[PDB]
Ligand binder design. Structure first.
Ligand SMILES: O=c1ccn([C@@H]2O[C@H](COP(=O)(O)OP(=O)(O)O)[C@@H](O)[C@H]2O)c(=O)[nH]1
Length: 446
C-alpha cells in the first residue's frame, strides 16, 4: 500500500518562531522518512531558515505571501509585519496547500501550525484533517488565554503587585506581569493582539497542542489545568536535533575568549533580536557593566554602538567583549558564564535553564514578563532587575548578587538543579519521549 501521509506545516513566519518549528519537523521527518512534510512559509521566512541549509528529502519548502504589497514600507515597529501576514487569512495559506498537493501529488492528511497562525485551523477544518498547534512561547502563558475576562478585570481594579491566584499553579504571577497586548481594548488593539486573545477558543479545537518545553519544569497544577482545557497536551523536548545545527562558527572568538575566564565568572548580556531597548537603558547597562568590574560578553546590535558611553568599550576592552552576534546557545553552554542578563524571550530562557545559567531579567514586551516571574518566583533561578528597568546602581547590585554574593547561593544552586532536571527529562524513557511518540502516531494515523 502506498504511504500517502502528508503533513502541512505553517510557521508563524517571523524570527525566533522559525527554528523551533523546523526543529520539530526535522525530528518528525527523520523518524517517518516515508511521510511527506510540506513546510509553508514566506519568502523572508524561507530565506531565514533554508539559505545555508540541507534538508531531508521528505521535507519540501513552499512560499506564500507575507501580506506586504510591493511598494509598501512598514513602519519600524515589531507588530506591523505580523499584522500584515495575519491579514492574508486562510486563502493565502490555502495557496500553500495547493503548491504542496501539486508537488507531492498527495492530499494533506494533517496540519501542524504555530498556534499564532489561527487561520490554519480554518484550513484544517475545510480539509477535515487534524490541526496540531505548536507553542514555542513561554509555556505558562497558555493559561492566560483561557482567563482573559478575569485577567482584564483584575488588572483594571487591583494593585500592580496583586497575585493571579485564580490561575491554577500560577499563583505567583502578578497583575504587573500580564502582557499589555491582552489588556488593550479599542484603538490600541491590533490584529496580532486579537489573534492571541482568540487562543482560548482556538486551542481546544486542536487535535493536540505541542509545547516546545519540559513538562518537568512547569508547575504540575498548571499542567493539569491545561490538560483539562485541551484535547491533548504534549511536551516535545525543544533541544536541537543534529540536522537543525550548522557547524558552529565564532567570528568574534567568543568561546576562546571565554576559555581564558574562570568558572561562572562572566556576565553574558543580550536582549534578543527584536527588542529596541530605550537608549537610556543601553547607557545604564554599559555603566553598570563597567562599574561592576566583572568580565562580560555583550551581544549588541552594531546600530547601538554609537550610543554607548564615550570610551566604554575601550576602557573595558581587557575584561569585556562587545560584539554584534554570538553563537548564543554555545556561549550559554560555556562553563565560564555565570549569569545571563536577558529580556526573557522563550528561546533564550530555554537555552539558559538547560545549561544551568541563572538570569537577571528585564522583560520588555509580550509574554516576557511571565517568563521573568517564573524565573524569579517559581524556578528561583534568577532575579528581575532591581527597579524593573536597567539602572546603573540596580543592575550592579543584581550582578553582584548572582555572580559573587552568598545571598545568591540559593539561586546558583537552583540553576544547577534545574539543569539536572532537564538532563534527566530528555532521556529515552522520559515522558517527553513518550509524548513525541504520541505525536508521531497522530501523524501516522491521519
Ligand atoms: O547574538 C545572538 C542573539 C540571539 N541569538 C539567538 O536568537 C534567539 C532569540 O530568541 P528569543 O525567543 O530569546 O527572543 P527574540 O529575539 O525572539 O525576542 C535565541 O535562539 C538566541 O540564542 C543568537 O544566537 N545570537
Amino acid at each position: 500500500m502506498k504511504n500517502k501521509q502528508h503533513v502541512a506545516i505553517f510557521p508563524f513566519p517571523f524570527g525566533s518562531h522559525l527554528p523551533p518549528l523546523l526543529n520539530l519537523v526535522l525530528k518528525l521527518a527523520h523518524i517517518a522518512p516515508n511521510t511527506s512534510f510540506s513546510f509553508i512559509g514566506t519568502h523572508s521566512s524561507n530565506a531565514f531558515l533554508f539559505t545555508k541549509r540541507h534538508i531531508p528529502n521528505n521535507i519540501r519548502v513552499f512560499t506564500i505571501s507575507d501580506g506586504i504589497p510591493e511598494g509598501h514600507v512598514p513602519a519600524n515597529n515589531p507588530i506591523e509585519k505580523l499584522d500584515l501576514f495575519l491579514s492574508t487569512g486562510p486563502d493565502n495559506l490555502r495557496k500553500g496547500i495547493e503548491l504542496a498537493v501539486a508537488e507531492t501529488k498527495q492530499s494533506v492528511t494533517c496540519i501542524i501550525a504555530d498556534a499564532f497562525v489561527t487561520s490554519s485551523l480554518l484550513v484544517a477544518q475545510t480539509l477535515n484533517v487534524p490541526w496540531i498547534a505548536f507553542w514555542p512561547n513561554v509555556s505558562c502563558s497558555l493559561s492566560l488565554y483561557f482567563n482573559i475576562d478575569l485577567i482584564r478585570d483584575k488588572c483594571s481594579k487591583d494593585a500592580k503587585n496583586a497575585t493571579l491566584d485564580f490561575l491554577p499553579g500560577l499563583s505567583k504571577l502578578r497583575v504587573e506581569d500580564v502582557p499589555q497586548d491582552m489588556l488593550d481594548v479599542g484603538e490600541k488593539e491590533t490584529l496580532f493582539s486579537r489573534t492571541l486573545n482568540s487562543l482560548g477558543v482556538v486551542l481546544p479545537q486542536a487535535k493536540a497542542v505541542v509545547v516546545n518545553f519540559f513538562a518537568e519544569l512547569d508547575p504540575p497544577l498548571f499542567v493539569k489545568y491545561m490538560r483539562s482545557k485541551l484535547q491533548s497536551l504534549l511536551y516535545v523536548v525543544p533541544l536541537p536535533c543534529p540536522q537543525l545545527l550548522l557547524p558552529e562558527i565564532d567570528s568574534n572568538g567568543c568561546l576562546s575568549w571565554l576559555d581564558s575566564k574562570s568558572s561562572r565568572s562572566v556576565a553574558y548580556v543580550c536582549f534578543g533580536t527584536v527588542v529596541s531597548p530605550p537608549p537610556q537603558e543601553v547607557v545604564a547597562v554599559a555603566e553598570a557593566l563597567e562599574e561592576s568590574g566583572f568580565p562580560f560578553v555583550w551581544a549588541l546590535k552594531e546600530s547601538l554602538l554609537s550610543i554607548l558611553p564615550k570610551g566604554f568599550v575601550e576602557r573595558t576592552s581587557t575584561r569585556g567583549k562587545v560584539v554584534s552576534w554570538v553563537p548564543q546557545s554555545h556561549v550559554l553552554s560555556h562553563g565560564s558564564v555565570g549569569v545571563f542578563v536577558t529580556h526573557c524571550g522563550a528561546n533564550s530562557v530555554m537555552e539558559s535553564v538547560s545549561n544551568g545559567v541563572p538570569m537577571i531579567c528585564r522583560p520588555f514586551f509580550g509574554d516576557q514578563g511571565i517568563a521573568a516571574r517564573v524565573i524569579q518566583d517559581i524556578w528561583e533561578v534568577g532575579v528581575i532587575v532591581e527597579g524593573k528597568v536597567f539602572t546603573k546602581n540596580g543592575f550592579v547590585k543584581s550582578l553582584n548578587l548572582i555572580l559573587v554574593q552568598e545571598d545568591g547561593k540559593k539561586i546558583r544552586d537552583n540553576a544547577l538543579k534545574v539543569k539536572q532536571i532537564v538532563q534527566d527529562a530528555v532521556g529515552p524513557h522520559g515522558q517527553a519521549a513518550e509524548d513525541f511518540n504520541t505525536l508521531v502516531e497522530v501523524i501516522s494515523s491521519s
